Design a protein around this ligand. Sequence first.
Ligand SMILES: [Cl-]
Ligand SMILES: [Cl-]
Ligand SMILES: [Cl-]
Ligand SMILES: [Cl-]
Ligand SMILES: [Cl-]
Ligand SMILES: [Cl-]
Ligand SMILES: [Cl-]
Ligand SMILES: [Cl-]
Ligand SMILES: [Cl-]
Ligand code: NA
Lengths: 386, 385
Amino acid sequence: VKYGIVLDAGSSHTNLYIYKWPVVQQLEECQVKGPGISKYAQKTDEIAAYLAECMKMSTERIPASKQHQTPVYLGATAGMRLLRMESKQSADEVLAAVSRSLKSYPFDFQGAKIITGQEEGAYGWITINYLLGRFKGSTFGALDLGGSSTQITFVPLNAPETSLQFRLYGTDYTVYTHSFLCYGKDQALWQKLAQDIQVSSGGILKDPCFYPGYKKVVNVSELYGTPCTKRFEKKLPFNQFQVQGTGDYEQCHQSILKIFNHCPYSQCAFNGVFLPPLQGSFGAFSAFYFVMDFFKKMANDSSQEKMTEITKNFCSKPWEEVKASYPTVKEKYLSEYCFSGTYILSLLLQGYNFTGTSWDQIHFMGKIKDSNAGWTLGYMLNLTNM
Amino acid sequence: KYGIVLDAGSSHTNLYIYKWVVQQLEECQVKGPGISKYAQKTDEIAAYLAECMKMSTERIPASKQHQTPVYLGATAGMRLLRMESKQSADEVLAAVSRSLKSYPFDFQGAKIITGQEEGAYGWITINYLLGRFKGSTFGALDLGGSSTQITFVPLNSTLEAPETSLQFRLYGTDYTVYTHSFLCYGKDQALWQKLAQDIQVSSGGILKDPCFYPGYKKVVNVSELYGTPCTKRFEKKLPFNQFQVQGTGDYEQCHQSILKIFNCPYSQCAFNGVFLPPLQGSFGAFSAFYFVMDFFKKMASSQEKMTEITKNFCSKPWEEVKASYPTVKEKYLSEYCFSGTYILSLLLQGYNFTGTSWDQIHFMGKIKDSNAGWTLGYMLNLTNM
Ligand SMILES: [Cl-]
Ligand SMILES: [Cl-]
Ligand SMILES: [Cl-]
Ligand SMILES: [Cl-]
Ligand SMILES: [Cl-]
Ligand SMILES: [Cl-]
Ligand SMILES: [Cl-]
Ligand SMILES: [Cl-]
Ligand SMILES: [Cl-]
Ligand code: NA
């Protein structure tokens, strides 16, 4: 039996996966407590301890004899793309600190790098299609959404810059992939606040994307701390402000549409980016999954008309009610949900154009065959040549 | 070694033969308009391409021929055709392919390149040719019938990061290049936008126009005018099949009326809500920037100067003008007042080359007996240099 370890260093979490193979399977997953590694830009010496728990789990989990032969990879995504954008130097320092830390365990260190969006979207499409056994025919589109970027990867029926050719089990595949940096659910929220905060705000932001009675305090330097808001930057007369929920789905939608900008093609995603016509089935995972899943589970674990209605209803539940109603859910997720859901609906319908007949062809999944839908398996695959 | 690239633009298809530093060996302009005009009559494509293709088989030694790659890259003319009919565009591309496939070269594809792939390659093309990769680089302004690109590195590094951005690692340097392509902002499509806008229902079937010389007349068919996606936003029910353009030959007013077919979340934009970073460093403007500005230059430097020259030229009656320049094709000559004024607004208001910035632009036809154009830049890619 063989083992491999891949760390998915995304902008909200670093997730470590252990794979094994006598078909390859996920043996275990570990979520590193804390945010993504880019938040370590100053305090890179703390990275070692940050990674310690998930790394110790792996040394306790893989037999000692198999350990020096076991490869270890870190692939970083949009969070780190943004950090690099801000400071090449910082991003490098973070990657090096990660490296020193992983190098020290008794595994075969294989590199820490920022993978491209074009790679990432590809690999996740591989992971899913592998997992469904759809490589044992015709295939599933891959929709990914994290804190910072969102990807879409699928095969259309017979704009080269954007495509990938790839031969896999005797078949040559042309796969459309694209990554919208700044369009993960969190960066969108930033974009939306930046844009909506006027100078006259008073340090108070009434917002329809959050529940009546929610309050959250937001720091201007953090908010302008990311490249995704450079475009809305103003010099502000206060060093922070407080978001106040008005919980109105209508308006929150309206206001979410504003962070997206005619199209030079047959049809587009948004921002002038080409999108081919929709084709076949899709699996929507990560934030897509977790968010939709929370809403689905108020619809007897349905349609776009019904999902929208569920969200409108939910967004108006006062905050105290929402908390009390879902007491076992982390306050940090629970608060995002009205925004996230509203956001996800728009991204799929106006964004990826999943309107009309197209809506039901999306199947939301966390795991296939007890293995996480993500890109790290795909990355694993190509990397092992298994 | 040799390679061939066809530049299928909206007015002309141009074939380039490169050989190898890489040099243009020869160029051939295919007679007729661009391939999109073949949408119905795709079987005619073969003969249309025949002259320039035979030239190449006569030109490259036979032994070198099977090893020689051949590419066709199509630009905004074909983007517009695809926008009207996916199917048509595909049929055109296929007909082109069957035709090219039949020659004894190494057929490497016929495709519509993106405005960014377009702005990219052209920017690469000039910097290669100016020996710039060794140092730092020049901006690229390209203008054609249907579209206009602008491509340059801003000081900022990443700032706006909107996907108006590329990476291009090139002989050891990773370059963050801003590039955009304004579809329908080529000189011709901008002309038709302007007519389309300014035509009033009441008109009688005559459009008085100040971008044309006193005494200029041209008859324009309404179904051609509305036949492009670019005047879609301007369509109106008109009580006539055609109308006549009549120059009143006034630059002031031409400028006025040109501005109107232009419309910003950002610190700054180009036009129409599209981001543009701060202008930075120097630029080579080419294709129609060069063929039009060079014409005016030859009636002499500075921008107030090129303005005075265009105001004056726009007043010369059409009979005078045609007599003054008898060796020029009436099809180009008749457009110059408009193009000059256009170019001047595009550079100054669009791209903000106002004041001080102006003199950073060097218009250029060709560097080292090689054309400014995307094609050579493509060529260096299509041999992973
Ligand atoms: Cl991160
Ligand atoms: Cl992400
Ligand atoms: Cl994020
Ligand atoms: Cl409350
Ligand atoms: Cl709960
Ligand atoms: Cl054409
Ligand atoms: Cl063009
Ligand atoms: Cl044109
Ligand atoms: Cl002459
Ligand atoms: Na859309």
